[PDB]
């Protein structure tokens, strides 16, 4: 319902899907010859099936194929400065695929739409829907467009005739924030006590020995640390 969604929103007012409390299969995403761009920051595409995150956001919009480059950490351009801003410490990844047969039509598809005009560069992960016109000249427009008074929003003009870089390319951004809940399949084996093992407790990897803890926890506390990021005690997630 994120990827084969019938309608994607425009890049100024893109749609957000919250993903939580499920098991994600990333084999079907990396193992597809449809996605032109599959480039991942902070994670590798191969080891995404063994990482387990608190929450996953899915951001969907349509840009032309020439500016899939701008959807990246620390890029500049129009879409990156005014429509869609990714932070420089971005974890998660952006993908794209060609959608000429669904979003471009004869006579031009004037539904998909982008902001060109804004006074300031956009904050990352804070995205606006406002429709007040832009005053580039000195005369106050007072909400009247005309000369030196531009509406800041206009369409892309998607033609099937134009080149590969001007075709509509559906961009779906995945973001991972690292009590983890969203992770792929692996055999959750039995606990092994009093032995030097390689634990993987809900993504908290490491090695050590596992005994019971006599110290009292509270129902909201997942794991325990004593000093300087050392994982002292843990709860099994089952």
């Amino acid at each position, epitope marked *: 319902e994120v990827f084969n969604a019938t309608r994607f929103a425009s890049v100024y007012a893109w749609n957000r899907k919250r993903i939580s409390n499920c098991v994600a299969d990333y084999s079907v995403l990396y193992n597809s010859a449809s996605f032109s761009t599959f480039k991942c920051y902070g994670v590798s595409p191969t080891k995404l099936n063994d990482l387990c995150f608190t929450n996953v956001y899915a951001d969907s919009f349509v840009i032309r194929g020439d500016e899939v480059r701008q959807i990246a950490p620390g890029q500049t351009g129009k879409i990156a400065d005014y429509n869609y801003k990714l932070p420089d410490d971005f974890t998660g990844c952006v993908i794209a695929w060609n959608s000429n047969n669904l979003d471009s039509k004869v*006579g031009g598809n*004037y*539904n998909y*739409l982008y902001r060109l005009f804004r006074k300031s560069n956009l904050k990352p992960f804070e995205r606006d829907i406002s*429709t007040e016109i832009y005053q580039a000249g000195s005369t106050p*427009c*007072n*909400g009247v*467009e005309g000369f030196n008074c531009y509406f800041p*929003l206009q369409s892309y003009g998607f033609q099937p005739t134009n080149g590969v870089g001007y075709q509509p390319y559906r961009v779906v951004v995945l973001s991972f924030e690292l009590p983890a809940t969203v992770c792929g399949p692996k055999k959750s084996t039995n606990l092994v006590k009093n032995k030097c093992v390689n634990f993987n407790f809900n993504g908290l990897t490491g090695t050590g020995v596992l005994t019971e803890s006599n110290k009292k926890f509270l129902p909201f506390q997942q794991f325990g640390r004593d000093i300087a990021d050392t994982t002292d005690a843990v709860r099994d997630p089952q």
Partner: antibody, heavy 124, light 112 residues
Framework: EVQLLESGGGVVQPGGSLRLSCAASGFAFTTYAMNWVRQAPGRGLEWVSAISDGGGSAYYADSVKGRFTISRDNSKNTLYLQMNSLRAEDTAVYYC??????????????????WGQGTLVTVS | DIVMTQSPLSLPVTPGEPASISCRSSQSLLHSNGYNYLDWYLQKPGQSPQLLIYLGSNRASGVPDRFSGSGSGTDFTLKISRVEAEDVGVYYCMQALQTPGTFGQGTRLEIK
């Protein structure tokens, strides 16, 4: 490039319904405002209805409050005007015409730069 | 509402001569932003009407330069410097302040 197409409007018995559909081809129909105009043969124009972006704000003229039903589809870029309780004085040239207005004080019922192609409704 | 008046209605003007067209308003159309809100139109016979001048002064799209509107407050005037056979039409006036969009009675320009 930009032009407006209409459909429907013809011979109709009074006191019933009719359909008129306005489809757009070359503009940003989400962002532009939209307006409705009646023109009788032999006297000039009369505004009847107007709508803002995304529905919500619908306005009616003095004789047509409740008589006319207005609706908007932002997906298929079509403008509708559902028709109720037709009268012989409603025999007029009905056509969709668009407005500039996108500013705060541009007043969606105001400056209408383009007008549509045109069709005649005969209530007889 | 706004009781509107276009006078005189039938205008026989020799081609090449200037023609002066007026529309009058009961209430002041000057808003708090200082701009004029009254719009000037032309209807060709059998062809859909056009916006000629918006807001009293400025270029509507495709309108030739010899069409010019004037006025402030209530007394506005539309002027053409040169009238030709393509300038035949019936001239209207519409406001944008109140709820009903009030039209003019129509100023028929005729060629002698």
């Amino acid at each position: 490039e930009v032009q407006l197409l209409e459909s429907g409007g013809g011979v109709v018995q009074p006191g019933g319904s009719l359909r008129l559909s306005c489809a757009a081809s070359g503009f940003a129909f989400t962002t532009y405002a939209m307006n409705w105009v009646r023109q009788a043969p032999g006297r000039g124009l009369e505004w009847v209805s107007a709508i803002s972006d995304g529905g919500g704000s619908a306005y009616y003229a003095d004789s047509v409050k409740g008589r006319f039903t207005i609706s908007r589809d932002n997906s298929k870029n079509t403008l509708y005007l559902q028709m109720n309780s037709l009268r012989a004085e409603d025999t007029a040239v009905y056509y969709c015409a668009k407005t500039r207005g996108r500013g705060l004080y541009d007043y969606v019922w105001g400056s209408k730069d383009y007008w549509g192609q045109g069709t005649l409704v005969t209530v007889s | 509402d706004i009781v509107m008046t276009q006078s005189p209605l039938s205008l026989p003007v020799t081609p090449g001569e200037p023609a002066s067209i007026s529309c009058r308003s009961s209430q002041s159309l000057l808003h708090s932003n200082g701009y004029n809100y009254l719009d000037w139109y032309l209807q060709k016979p059998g062809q859909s009407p056009q916006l000629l001048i918006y807001l009293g002064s400025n270029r509507a799209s495709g309108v030739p330069d010899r069409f010019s509107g004037s006025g402030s407050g209530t007394d506005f005037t539309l002027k053409i410097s040169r009238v030709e056979a393509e300038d035949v039409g019936v001239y209207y006036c519409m406001q944008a302040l109140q709820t009903p969009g009030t039209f003019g009675q129509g100023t028929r320009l005729e060629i002698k």
